[PDB]
Amino acid sequence: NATRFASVYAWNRKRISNCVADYSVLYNLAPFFTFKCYGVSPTKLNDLCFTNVYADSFVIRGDEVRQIAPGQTGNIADYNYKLPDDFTGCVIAWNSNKLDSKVSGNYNYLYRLFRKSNLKPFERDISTEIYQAGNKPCNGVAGFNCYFPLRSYSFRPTYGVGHQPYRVVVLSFELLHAPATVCGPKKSTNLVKNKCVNFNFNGLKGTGVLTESNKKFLPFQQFGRDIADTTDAVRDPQTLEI
Amino acid sequence: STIEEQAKTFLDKFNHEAEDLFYQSSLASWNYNTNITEENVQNMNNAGDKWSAFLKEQSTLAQMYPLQEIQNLTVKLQLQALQQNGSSVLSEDKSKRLNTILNTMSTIYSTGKVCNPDNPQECLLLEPGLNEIMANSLDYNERLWAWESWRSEVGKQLRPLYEEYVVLKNEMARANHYEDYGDYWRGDYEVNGVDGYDYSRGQLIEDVEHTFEEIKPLYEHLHAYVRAKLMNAYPSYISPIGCLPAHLLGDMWGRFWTNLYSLTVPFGQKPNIDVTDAMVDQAWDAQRIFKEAEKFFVSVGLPNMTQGFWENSMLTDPGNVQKAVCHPTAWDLGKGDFRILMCTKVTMDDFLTAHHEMGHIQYDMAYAAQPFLLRNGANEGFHEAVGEIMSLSAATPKHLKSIGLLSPDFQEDNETEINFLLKQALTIVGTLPFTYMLEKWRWMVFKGEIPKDQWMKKWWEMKREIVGVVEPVPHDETYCDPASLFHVSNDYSFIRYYTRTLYQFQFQEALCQAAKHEGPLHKCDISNSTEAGQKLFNMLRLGKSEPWTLALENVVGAKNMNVRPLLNYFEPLFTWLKDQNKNSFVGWSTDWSPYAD
């Protein structure tokens, strides 16, 4: 929900690490235009989580959302950015006709359509290289069969479905050998007392009766044990009470 | 560094402001057609001159080393639409004079003022005025004024203005390694790089001649049917042996024969098929007429449209304070978007153009992720040939029953479809030899084999042996009959209307062979068939990445331009015009003249 963004070859690295993800206001409300992705479903992201999450901010056409796919070739998918075969993220697009556009042409952020070679996945290429396709060199200028790359946007909110400003935020997920740090939301239930019920806590699982405790405790603890090494205490994960 | 690895990187800093400098002249021309103010015309000029200089700034810096090192087929087919230098190969006094002669040629065509020389005290406006007085005036002296005087006050100074315009037009194309400007319209038809499917520019001269030989039995029976029905209207003006006069064809020149339908009715006891009387009872508005017409696009198998089409484009004229020009043009404004500006009324001709102008949207929708040089037609006439397949399928009485339009018990005999097919004969077949004799006139005055005195004498000698009309007065070498139209004065291509009627018929003859329709092809409707879109989806997405020779292989399978879909579409029209022409004269002759008294 930013007010600015970046180019598709000048991708910033929003390093989401050591966070708590809240998808009850973003995924469940869904104020975006389309909500469709592959690999991992968005309903599995609340019950499964990953090591490092990386994000970006780039606005493209509505015709280039078919190019954002794992294993895709074509116009954008080999020359501006590339999605790998192990892509476990999701791609969300939203029409930004009232925010990201500009009257009298949008002449500020640039994008490409071709390249010298096939780039690597998540490659930040900001080069202004001089091309030579034939047998005579170009000395820095374009020519017959000599071309040059670097041109900006054409956004305006008065037209149809093809090249409206669509803000695409690719939330790339990555599971490594390191333990997880950013995990999504999970629902809670009510708490009943003075009854033989089961326990499903943040770090406890068992069956017992919840009564009022009269002992002292440390707030950085999860549970406590008695003199016979049995679990006789539980801290609430929401409130500071045992 | 390797020669084989380097394919194509032109589309970075060319193909992103080829739209964007045209974008700033796109809405500025669109606001010129909706909000005609004093400052909404100035933004067309300074932004359109930046895009006009963009095609000449990169052309001067593309003059280094030649073409023959390329290997890929995708490189060469987009290279032909950029290496045309245009006007930038002439001098400073010759190239900029072409820009000034094109602005004075479109001004007097739109703002012309010509009226009666007998009583010039009341002098009227041309374009809403003279377009509608041709239909209702049943007089010989009244129709003589609207054809002769219009080329006598507007077209009198174009004859010393078109002679040096042709001479400068030869210099800009002979330096572009072509033989003439005559193959500049045939430069889009040039196919090279594929073995077995090579279509040169010299092959197109015999191909229009090959498809014109078999239309001469079909056109001369329509030439003898309008003439035989004008005996009770004009008893002593039109000869039964000779040709028809050219000042009574219904329009300003005689391209369309649409106003000659009400006078040549075959049977007056049965009513015509009409949506206009049944529209005002159910109270339709502007939201209905595009939504059920877009239901025709879903049922073949093309996907839906989002909210950007309904809140941006309007269908109602924005008040009576501000003037809005509403000519039917589907706005192809760059890399796959369409805003529709149409002054819609309760009119059957407005209803068929709702399917026509949305048929140019569905061609550019499929290659919306393709480059802009491939975002075009397969030729110039390929864009409007795939647009009117939705209008001829919506004029079918089997389609009107499934929606809820006309009466559910309507009689359909053999004498019902003949009045519909002769309405299509003056829309499709009636403009077909008229497209031939003007494009052959364009291909005979550009090469320069003829002198200046045979410039206009060759024009009226072709019309008495190709289309079968004769002028009532003779013209000298100071007037111009073909140069008073919309396409020739604003420098547009006229080859695109001969291939409009040919590529449309090739697609509709095979579309319900997939949908399994038994009967004639004027009862063919392409709706309620999900497998009918899959034959089109490999054709709607090929644009100019594949040429027009390989584009016809997946529907009809003919690599050449043939006339055989045009014959069995009109199979009651070939049989029922034969028995009524037993005693009249078949064809025309070159001896009758109205001024040879």
UniProtKB/Swiss-Prot annotation, chain A:
<feature type="region of interest" description="Receptor-binding motif; binding to human ACE2">
    <location>
        <begin position="95"/>
        <end position="166"/>
    </location>
</feature>
<feature type="domain" description="BetaCoV S1-CTD">
    <location>
        <begin position="1"/>
        <end position="185"/>
    </location>
</feature>
<feature type="region of interest" description="Disordered">
    <location>
        <begin position="113"/>
        <end position="148"/>
    </location>
</feature>
<protein>
    <recommendedName>
        <fullName>Spike protein S1</fullName>
    </recommendedName>
</protein>
<feature type="region of interest" description="Immunodominant HLA epitope recognized by the CD8+; called NF9 peptide">
    <location>
        <begin position="106"/>
        <end position="114"/>
    </location>
</feature>
<feature type="disulfide bond">
    <location>
        <begin position="138"/>
        <end position="146"/>
    </location>
</feature>
<feature type="region of interest" description="Disordered">
    <location>
        <begin position="177"/>
        <end position="199"/>
    </location>
</feature>
<feature type="disulfide bond">
    <location>
        <begin position="37"/>
        <end position="90"/>
    </location>
</feature>
<feature type="region of interest" description="Receptor-binding domain (RBD)">
    <location>
        <begin position="1"/>
        <end position="199"/>
    </location>
</feature>
<comment type="function">
    <text>Attaches the virion to the cell membrane by interacting with host receptor, initiating the infection. The major receptor is host ACE2. When S2/S2' has been cleaved, binding to the receptor triggers direct fusion at the cell membrane. When S2/S2' has not been cleaved, binding to the receptor results in internalization of the virus by endocytosis using host TFRC and GRM2 and leading to fusion of the virion membrane with the host endosomal membrane. Alternatively, may use NRP1/NRP2 and integrin as entry receptors.</text>
</comment>
<feature type="disulfide bond">
    <location>
        <begin position="49"/>
        <end position="183"/>
    </location>
</feature>
<feature type="glycosylation site" description="N-linked (GlcNAc...) (complex) asparagine; by host">
    <location>
        <position position="1"/>
    </location>
</feature>
<feature type="region of interest" description="Integrin-binding motif;">
    <location>
        <begin position="61"/>
        <end position="63"/>
    </location>
</feature>
<comment type="subunit">
    <text>Binds to host ACE2. RBD also interacts with the N-linked glycan on 'Asn-90' of ACE2. Cleavage of S generates a polybasic C-terminal sequence on S1 that binds to host Neuropilin-1 (NRP1) and Neuropilin-2 (NRP2) receptors. Interacts with host integrin alpha-5/beta-1 (ITGA5:ITGB1) and with ACE2 in complex with integrin alpha-5/beta-1 (ITGA5:ITGB1). May interact via cytoplasmic c-terminus with M protein. May interact (via N-terminus) with host bilirubin and biliverdin, thereby preventing antibody binding to the SARS-CoV-2 spike NTD via an allosteric mechanism.</text>
</comment>
UniProtKB/Swiss-Prot annotation, chain B:
<dbReference type="GO" id="GO:0048662">
    <property type="term" value="P:negative regulation of smooth muscle cell proliferation"/>
</dbReference>
<feature type="glycosylation site" description="N-linked (GlcNAc...) asparagine">
    <location>
        <position position="528"/>
    </location>
</feature>
<dbReference type="GO" id="GO:0019065">
    <property type="term" value="P:receptor-mediated endocytosis of virus by host cell"/>
</dbReference>
<dbReference type="GO" id="GO:0016324">
    <property type="term" value="C:apical plasma membrane"/>
</dbReference>
<feature type="active site" description="Proton acceptor">
    <location>
        <position position="357"/>
    </location>
</feature>
<dbReference type="GO" id="GO:0005576">
    <property type="term" value="C:extracellular region"/>
</dbReference>
<dbReference type="GO" id="GO:0005788">
    <property type="term" value="C:endoplasmic reticulum lumen"/>
</dbReference>
<dbReference type="GO" id="GO:1903598">
    <property type="term" value="P:positive regulation of gap junction assembly"/>
</dbReference>
<feature type="disulfide bond">
    <location>
        <begin position="326"/>
        <end position="343"/>
    </location>
</feature>
<dbReference type="GO" id="GO:0001817">
    <property type="term" value="P:regulation of cytokine production"/>
</dbReference>
<dbReference type="GO" id="GO:0001618">
    <property type="term" value="F:virus receptor activity"/>
</dbReference>
<feature type="binding site">
    <location>
        <position position="459"/>
    </location>
    <ligand>
        <name>chloride</name>
    </ligand>
</feature>
<dbReference type="GO" id="GO:1905737">
    <property type="term" value="P:positive regulation of L-proline import across plasma membrane"/>
</dbReference>
<dbReference type="GO" id="GO:0000122">
    <property type="term" value="P:negative regulation of transcription by RNA polymerase II"/>
</dbReference>
<dbReference type="GO" id="GO:0060452">
    <property type="term" value="P:positive regulation of cardiac muscle contraction"/>
</dbReference>
<dbReference type="GO" id="GO:0004180">
    <property type="term" value="F:carboxypeptidase activity"/>
</dbReference>
<comment type="function">
    <text>Essential counter-regulatory carboxypeptidase of the renin-angiotensin hormone system that is a critical regulator of blood volume, systemic vascular resistance, and thus cardiovascular homeostasis. Converts angiotensin I to angiotensin 1-9, a nine-amino acid peptide with anti-hypertrophic effects in cardiomyocytes, and angiotensin II to angiotensin 1-7, which then acts as a beneficial vasodilator and anti-proliferation agent, counterbalancing the actions of the vasoconstrictor angiotensin II.</text>
</comment>
<dbReference type="GO" id="GO:0019229">
    <property type="term" value="P:regulation of vasoconstriction"/>
</dbReference>
<feature type="glycosylation site" description="N-linked (GlcNAc...) asparagine">
    <location>
        <position position="414"/>
    </location>
</feature>
<dbReference type="GO" id="GO:0019058">
    <property type="term" value="P:viral life cycle"/>
</dbReference>
<dbReference type="GO" id="GO:0016020">
    <property type="term" value="C:membrane"/>
</dbReference>
<keyword id="KW-1017">Isopeptide bond</keyword>
